Amino acid sequence: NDGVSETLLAWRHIDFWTSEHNPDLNATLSDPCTQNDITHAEEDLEVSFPNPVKASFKIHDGQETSGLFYGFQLMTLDQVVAMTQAWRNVAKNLNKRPDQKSIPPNAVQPVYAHPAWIPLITDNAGNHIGVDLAPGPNGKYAQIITFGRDFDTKFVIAENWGEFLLSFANDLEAGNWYLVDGELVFRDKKSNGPIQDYFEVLKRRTWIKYQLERPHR
Template structure:
């Protein structure tokens, strides 16, 4: 953990919010959490908790409105997911973006929940990545998170991204009675996990290459009638290119060259759709 990033982030946050980060956790508290989960915390995560044991319950949500969980809250969330993992009923589809970075499971007890949305969804630290992933990568998972993204390669990258977002003023502060919180994006009130679709990921080191507006327009103009029917109106083209799952079965397609604008595309025989 780069303490300079954290200190600078704390200073920047104070420009907009009352101090809300908790006092440091003790080594013993961290060791207890590790023992309960059977997981060794990555160094960056351990150092983050040695700086702050989560945030105050009335805080605005360190992660763009989503709270930074204390170790007790981490354990509460982890125990819920551990019980769910042991139940074969919850064997739902899951997809990794990029592919082969996150193990494609509905739940994995080796995902450390560091934030939640109170709706069954979490930000987590992945200590059991797939072949191309990195231990310590930040991911999303949960009830509504079928598609799982590598949000950041490490927690310090996510904190730096938050700092840069504050400096660039690309955020919105919301007031609801006595509750103050914030969200990613200027003049928006979008759940951070929903905003991931419009963020270059992983933050700071994106793998998706955004197409320029002109490139997208030229691509759309080149489509035949069949493909335009599939894509929809021209204003839908950018979203189609960046969609995570494309259901194309039964479309009678012969020419699939338009899919070259979509990245990481492959066919899943299990569900018979093209996925990226």
């Protein structure tokens, strides 16, 4: 019940989809990590990766310049290690010295940086989508969160990496995309709406979902 099934399924949609509607993007998907690559990264960060994340890495070791997730790049294992260490330095500096918030409330620690937030996606401008290994009291271990430079408010966008990948795969299959050969961007088809930043889409979806679940105790 870890989201491994979802990860494998999703990568199929995404592998098939890219090869059909954007080969240039397909070609940036790297070879699988070896178990040793993963072990070495776990040793370096002193962390245990969630099953669905390891499953994802054993399919593609990130991307080798045009973001797969509507412009946002899937990070290589080496990039994940390096960036985690970069966030860990930032955290150290803050510990030896705007208001940070969470949606849902108390799901994510109200802090700028945490050693246990492992970035998997980057916008190459300081913001990420990653796996949270130190949830707030109303969060879940290995929930998927947004965090980074411009994320004073953190959002939980998925229950695991599998559900995140699959919901991205569902967006592609639903036709919620525009090509700008060109760059992949998001548009909501059913509504015939404008191009939107995928972060804003994820944020609104999180916010909507939270609001519709509030009534149930």
